[PDB]
Amino acid sequence: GSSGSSGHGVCWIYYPDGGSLVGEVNEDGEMTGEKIAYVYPDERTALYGKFIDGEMIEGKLATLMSTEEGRPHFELMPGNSVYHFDKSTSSCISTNALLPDPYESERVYVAESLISSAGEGLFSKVAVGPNTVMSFYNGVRITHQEVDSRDWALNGNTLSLDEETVIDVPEPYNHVSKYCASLGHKANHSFTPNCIYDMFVHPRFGPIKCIRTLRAVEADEELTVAYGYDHEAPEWYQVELKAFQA
Numbered sequence: 139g140s141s142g143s144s145g146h147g148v149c150w151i152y153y154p155d156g157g158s159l160v161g162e163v164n165e166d167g168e169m170t171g172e173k174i175a176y177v178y179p180d181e182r183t184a185l186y187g188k189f190i191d192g193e194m195i196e197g198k199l200a201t202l203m204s205t206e207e208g209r210p211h212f213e214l215m216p217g218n219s220v221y222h223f224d225k226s227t228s229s230c231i232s233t234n235a236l237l238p239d240p241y242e243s244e245r246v247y248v249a250e251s252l253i254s255s256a257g258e259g260l261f262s263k264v265a266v267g268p269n270t271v272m273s274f275y276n277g278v279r280i281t282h283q284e285v286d287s288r289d290w291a292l293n294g295n296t297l298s299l300d301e302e303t304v305i306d307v308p309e310p311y312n313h314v315s316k317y318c319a320s321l322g323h324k325a326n327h328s329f330t331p332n333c334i335y336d337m338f339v340h341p342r343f344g345p346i347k348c349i350r351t352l353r354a355v356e357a358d359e360e361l362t363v364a365y366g367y368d369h370e371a372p373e374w375y376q377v378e379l380k381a382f383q384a
């Protein structure tokens with residue numbers, strides 16, 4: 139009446155790894171909707187689409203073009219590439235083993251390693267700064283007991299994830315033609331690495347490890363990482379180890 143007259147809120151959840159969830163939350167404050175997005179650590183590559191409580195139901199490849207007062211504008215990338223939360227188990231590595239991670243695909247590729255008799259290695263596509271997430275280490279999730287209690291000829295692709303879980307990429311998935319959803323396992327070992335394994339929360343893969351650079355790397359530099367066995371360990375390692383003090 140006798141008073142002057144006149145005539146919604148976006149939320150960002152950042153992970154320690156630099157990735158993030160973004161959208162409007164529902165009445166209960168959960169990331170639920172069809173306009174929710176996950177944003178890779180480059181803060182431009184995105185998976186936009188349907189999410190229930192932060193879990194990706196249907197993420198379409200997208201680019202974060204700009205942000206205005208916390209409100210992100212997304213723009214769909216060309217194609218039919220869609221992604222969903224697809225956490226592996228102890229026997230299922232992926233529901234779409236041949237569906238590449240789009241972020242990884244821009245940064246790494248697999249070629250023959252420069253380290254002799256190392257096999258294949260992982261290489262960069264891009265000159266980047268230190269601390270750049272480059273690649274993802276996904277695989278099946280088996281316990282420390284199963285791993286530790288079997289031969290070393292089975293553990294060439296095992297990477298401890300935490301106190302409870304080891305990640306493995308077992309036969310035939312060590313072949314790029316059978317599994318290329320993630321490529322972290324293609325990085326060979328150096329006692330003078332340019333990367334580390336690091337924690338990562340992936341919208342498709344769940345909690346896993348990634349390869350993150352320790353420093354600047356050139357386009358086409360081989361990406362290496364210290365495997366970190368205890369001082370037991372495979373022969374080539376034990377051999378490379380002793381052949382390093384010099």
Ligand SMILES: CCCCCCN(CC[C@H](N)C(=O)O)C[C@H]1O[C@@H](n2cnc3c(N)ncnc32)[C@H](O)[C@@H]1O
Nearest residue numbers: 255256257258294295296323324325326327365374
């Ligand atoms: C705990 C870390 C888990 C990820 C390791 C996976 N692979 C690397 C990928 C392998 N080049 C391949 O083409 O599937 C390691 C295998 O590659 C060779 N390799 C890795 N680094 C090497 C080095 N510095 N020297 C010789 N051989 C090496 C050995 O045959 C390993 O079993």
